[PDB]
Protein backbone atom coordinates (compact mmCIF):
# COMPACT_ATOMS: atom_id res chain seq x y z
CA UNK A 1 0.00 0.00 0.00
CA UNK A 2 1.78 3.12 -1.02
CA UNK A 3 0.22 6.34 -2.52
CA UNK A 4 1.88 9.69 -3.68
CA UNK A 5 2.22 12.62 -3.21
CA UNK A 6 2.82 16.00 -4.98
CA UNK A 7 1.69 18.98 -3.29
CA UNK A 8 -0.06 20.97 -5.89
CA UNK A 9 1.14 19.85 -8.91
CA UNK A 10 4.87 20.39 -9.17
CA UNK A 11 6.69 17.52 -8.11
CA UNK A 12 5.23 14.25 -7.32
CA UNK A 13 6.75 12.57 -4.47
CA UNK A 14 6.14 9.25 -2.84
CA UNK A 15 4.51 8.33 0.80
CA UNK A 16 3.97 5.40 2.55
CA UNK A 17 1.21 5.25 5.32
CA UNK A 18 1.20 3.59 7.70
CA UNK A 19 0.12 3.64 11.04
CA UNK A 20 -2.39 3.37 10.81
CA UNK A 21 -3.39 4.07 7.39
CA UNK A 22 -4.35 1.74 4.84
CA UNK A 23 -5.79 4.25 2.16
CA UNK A 24 -5.39 7.39 -0.32
CA UNK A 25 -7.41 10.44 -0.88
CA UNK A 26 -6.97 13.56 -3.06
CA UNK A 27 -8.21 16.70 -1.11
CA UNK A 28 -8.78 20.08 -2.81
CA UNK A 29 -9.93 23.90 -2.37
CA UNK A 30 -9.17 27.26 -3.04
CA UNK A 31 -9.22 29.75 -1.00
CA UNK A 32 -6.97 32.80 -0.52
CA UNK A 33 -4.94 32.98 -2.48
CA UNK A 34 -6.99 30.67 -3.90
CA UNK A 35 -6.15 27.59 -4.66
CA UNK A 36 -4.40 24.69 -2.92
CA UNK A 37 -4.05 20.88 -3.67
CA UNK A 38 -2.73 18.02 -1.49
CA UNK A 39 -2.26 14.28 -1.74
CA UNK A 40 -1.48 12.14 0.75
CA UNK A 41 -2.63 9.28 2.42
CA UNK A 42 -6.00 8.90 4.49
CA UNK A 43 -10.27 9.19 3.40
CA UNK A 44 -11.71 10.26 6.02
CA UNK A 45 -14.01 12.77 5.38
CA UNK A 46 -15.93 15.28 5.38
CA UNK A 47 -16.73 18.34 3.91
CA UNK A 48 -18.64 19.76 1.37
CA UNK A 49 -17.97 22.08 -1.30
CA UNK A 50 -14.14 21.47 -1.71
CA UNK A 51 -13.05 18.71 -3.96
CA UNK A 52 -12.36 15.64 -2.29
CA UNK A 53 -11.21 11.84 -4.06
CA UNK A 54 -10.73 8.72 -1.95
CA UNK A 55 -9.18 5.50 -3.69
CA UNK A 56 -7.18 2.70 -2.29
CA UNK A 57 -6.03 0.62 -5.44
CA UNK A 58 -2.37 0.14 -5.76
CA UNK A 59 -1.05 3.57 -6.84
CA UNK A 60 -4.73 5.43 -7.17
CA UNK A 61 -3.98 9.05 -6.78
CA UNK A 62 -3.34 10.25 -9.97
Given at each position: ???H???????????????????????????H??????????????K???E?????????N?
Amino acid sequence: LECHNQQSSQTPTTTGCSGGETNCYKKRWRDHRGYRTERGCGCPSVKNGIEINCCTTDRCNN
